[PDB]
Design a protein around this ligand. Sequence first.
Ligand code: HEM
Ligand code: HEM
Lengths: 145, 145
Amino acid sequence: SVYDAAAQLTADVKKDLRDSWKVIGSDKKGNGVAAMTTLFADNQETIGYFKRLGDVSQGMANDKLRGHSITLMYALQNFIDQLDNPDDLVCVVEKFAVNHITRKISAAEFGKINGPIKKVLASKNFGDKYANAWAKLVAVVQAAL
Amino acid sequence: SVYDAAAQLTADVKKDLRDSWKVIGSDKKGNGVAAMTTLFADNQETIGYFKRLGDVSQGMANDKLRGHSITLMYALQNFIDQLDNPDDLVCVVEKFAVNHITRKISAAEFGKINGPIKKVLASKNFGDKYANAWAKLVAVVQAAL
Ligand code: HEM
Ligand code: HEM
């Protein structure tokens, strides 16, 4: 359950999420687009869910993809800001899940974002310990789908 | 259209938006809920769009309403952060409008949020000058609906 998954965010996990976000979240447009382009490159099967975005290979030059990418980063910002209060983190995660559930995005499908995040982190010199921390946060969302 | 509305965001308007957000955005949960409960109190008919939230009379204590309220504030955070680049502001505003268009929320209906925002600003001692600035930001979104 989402309530049990949120309890998995231990002290050190929260600290690593914050320290890495301080860097990653500093360039929401660049890192957001990088995450999406990587998702579409490593998992082409997901492109179907984003038909409204148009030609996703244009990257930064595609206004719709750019708008979506920047916006995606503010959801992560939201999650990070709620780490201090589990009750708030949970209500924000379930709120976030509503539209993804409507789109029939499964926990397994959502988990495909882990790869892209790990690569963005690595490009900023954040290794496996950080990727694992982020996978735990993604797991809270997966529990709500 | 959205670009033209964005043109009404002059240097002084952006300055007042940023200065007031520095305060309003510092308590997203508190001010987000205040805005929503004020919307429901002054325009009860808008509750028709929020059946999923349940008993909105519970206010802050309602987890779904609290989740939505906090999340609403990150959309404004996004807008404020993109003020210095019209190209990014416009793509984020058009991205934001998509789900609201699907919900059949007209520009006139969306405009009902102006009163609640004006009241939230006044609670922090930000007068008409600031309320007018925010109405102009809301107008940019209205142009996309
Ligand atoms: C870290 C992971 C992710 C974050 C933070 C995220 C964030 C968001 C946000 C904030 C929105 C806009 C609000 C909404 O409509 O719900 C959105 C839209 C969307 N998301 Fe997610 N998302 C993530 C991963 C995914 C994945 C893995 C998929 C599909 C495999 C997905 C598919 C969608 C779709 C199709 C839209 C609508 C795109 C459009 O037409 O503009 N998301 N997401
Ligand atoms: C400055 C004003 C507003 C902001 C920043 C805002 C922000 C948001 C955000 C970020 C979401 C979540 C993503 C999505 O599903 O689109 C959302 C959802 C929603 N918004 Fe807006 N919104 C605003 C005003 C309004 C107004 C005035 C209405 C209707 C009178 C409205 C009705 C909705 C509804 C029904 C949802 C889904 C609620 C749920 O079931 O969780 N919004 N809005």
